[PDB]
């Protein structure tokens, strides 16, 4: 629900989620990077 | 070719070279080229059908993901998911309408396909 929940998940965990493609993972990284955040903090 | 009795691409591909060389105006280079084209046409036709349904191309590529039966591979290929890469690129939502595929089973197959394509 929150950005703080998303930032704790690893890239390998997000790829296990249902309806989660490589394209949507790249979108999430690019958007988090635009805000100075990274996956796995 | 039809007047000389050839009706199929198989006849042209496999008939003895002597019978094709008896046709007026065929030389050995042209007969070899005609046979190579006939063999290439047959290969293309076979590959196309095997990718459209689940005969061989999708029965090996799309069916690489552990769990894919031949019926499911043909259902995937009917949606344009012909290869193990095409399946690795899908979401669960893109496969949700396939009769006999639960969201959990779709998720497991996509993850198996990704493990082979992206982490093998």
User: Is the C-alpha dihedral spanning B105, B59, B74, B40 positive or negative?
Assistant: positive
Of A16, A19, A22, the CB nearest to B89: A22
**Elucidated via:** cryo-EM
Task: Give B118's contacts in chain A (Cβ within 8 Å).
Answer: 22
Q: Which domains does chain B have, with CATH numbers?
A: 1-50 (1.10.150.20), 70-119 (1.10.150.20)
Q: What is the resolution of this structure in A?
A: 3.7
| Vertex B108: Cα angle to B103 and B112 (nearest 5) | 145
The whole-angstrom separation of Cα A33 and Cα B88 is 25
The whole-angstrom separation of Cα A28 and Cα A6 is 9
Q: What is the largest CA-CA distance in chain B?
A: 64
Of A15, A16, A21, the CB nearest to B90: A21
Cβ contact, residue pair A22, B118, below 8 Å: yes
Region of residue B67 (left: phi > 0; alpha: psi -120 to 50; beta: else)? left
Tokens for A40, please give them. Answer: 């796995």
Cβ contact, residue pair A18, B89, below 8 Å: no
Task: Find out whether B77 and B48 touch, Cβ atoms under 8 Å.
Answer: no
Residues ≥6 apart with Cβ < 8 Å to B43: none
């Amino acid at each position: 629900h929150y950005i703080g929940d998303l930032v704790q998940r690893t890239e390998v965990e997000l790829l296990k989620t249902p309806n989660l493609g490589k394209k949507s993972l790249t979108e999430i990284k690019d958007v988090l990077a635009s805000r100075g955040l990274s996956l796995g903090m | 070719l039809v007047e000389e009795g050839f009706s199929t691409l198989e006849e042209l591909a496999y008939v003895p070279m002597k019978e094709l060389l008896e046709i007026e105006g065929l030389d050995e280079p042209t007969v070899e080229a005609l046979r190579e084209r006939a063999k290439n046409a047959l290969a293309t036709i076979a590959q196309a059908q095997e990718e459209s349904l689940g005969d061989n191309k999708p029965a090996d590529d799309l069916l690489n993901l552990e769990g894919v039966d031949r019926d499911l591979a043909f259902k995937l290929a009917a949606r344009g998911v012909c290869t193990l890469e095409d399946l690795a690129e899908q979401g669960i939502d893109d496969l949700a309408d396939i009769e006999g595929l639960t969201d959990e089973k779709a998720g497991a197959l996509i993850m198996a396909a990704r493990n082979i394509c992206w982490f093998g």
